[PDB]
Protein: poly(adp-ribose) glycohydrolase
Organism: Homo sapiens
Amino acid sequence: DKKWLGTPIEEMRRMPRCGIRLPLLRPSANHTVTIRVDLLRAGEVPKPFPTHYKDLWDNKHVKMPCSEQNLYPVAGSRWELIQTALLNKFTRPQNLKDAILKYNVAYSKKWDFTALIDFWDKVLEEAEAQHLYQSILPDMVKIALCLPNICTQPIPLLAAAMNHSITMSQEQIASLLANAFFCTFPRRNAKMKSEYSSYPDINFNRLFEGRSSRKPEKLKTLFCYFRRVTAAAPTGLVTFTRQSLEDFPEWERCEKPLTRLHVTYEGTIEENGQGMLQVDFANRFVGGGVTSAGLVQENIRFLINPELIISRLFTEVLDHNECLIITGTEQYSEYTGYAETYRWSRSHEDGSERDDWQRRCTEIVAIDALHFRRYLDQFVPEKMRRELNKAYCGFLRPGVSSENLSAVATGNWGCGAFGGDARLKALIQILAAAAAERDVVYFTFGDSELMRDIYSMHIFLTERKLTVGDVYKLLLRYYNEECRNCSTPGPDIKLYPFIYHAVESC
């Protein structure tokens, strides 16, 4: 054999059709909106609000490159220097390197551009290089330099413990990402910062370093985006929401029953999870190595939907009780392979419907698992509860009734780069989803035996009417009986065999 098991996928809930009616979009104390809501119309470019640039340069907002406070000790205006640097014609990759370093002189002997030079000179055909330097690069300069007329409203930092949303236009995101490419964001570079030390990288300089054979594929993927958004302005909106919860379940006491499961070894979250809450297997610094050498699940998703990358501008490192929810990002590329075999394949025409706020009906949640370096570490109760609460915060929507919640589209979260056990993490996600009253659609990414094993456990537990609490207590017993007093790397028997025996024996 079977390709999928459990509840047919046609029976699972999907957006927009399962959705609450959206309230009117408006700015408020916990929702920043950077466009004119009164003028938002389908197929029209949104108008920035306010009409003229307003600057804040403080510890609660993004420091914009176009700020009059963005100065260089010669005090000269760094925005003026940026403009003079980028409005030269490029015909050779050294021209672009020298331009970026004019306003980054402190890094002129630290940043490496080898991958940019190789991409331009040694990967691209002559016609492709000419298209890059005659069309794509100068169009990117012009949208970057229009920043003060496009991003007129200060952008607040989504700082630790904030429950806050920012809704901005795709056009505004494109201007900001072109600045990131040209490495213009101030105060976001020094390795010995206090300021932004708790925020991810945003400037793209690590994309230009070294000789990995995957750098040209990352660059192709990004230039597909940049070519598209500079050739024709995108018309929709994107919302970024930080969610930080205070109250978590007492898991042992939870009387909720398990919800429905569809599990399959074919397909992916991004192709087969249309209208479902899509999980991003995050680093606590959202996007992880997307701007450097990373190229597994999250990093690939951030390349093919590049509007995700701008979350790194304003999103502080996630604490154990937090997630980031992004609604409306558009898919611009397709890919083949994975990690060391990843290739850009072609431009993607996103056919997702838009909602009443002109957002693509695509909802992604970044939740970072723990990175385990010893197998048995993950069965410690404190660490199981940490994973349960993280997944719960990712899945829960306070205020929303369960019949208006789509299924979760997820898979082997924390079980590749982060070293977790997929049979344990799958059960953890099933318990968290049950506590949030959502069904689960689980992609095992080619592993047919894991598909069979998750299905078998789920239907065993469901047919015996075990609650979330009953299951969580079984996990505590596995730790006590097989892990705590263990003094070899691996326990004597595996989680699922333990569970079947414990239940069938009683």
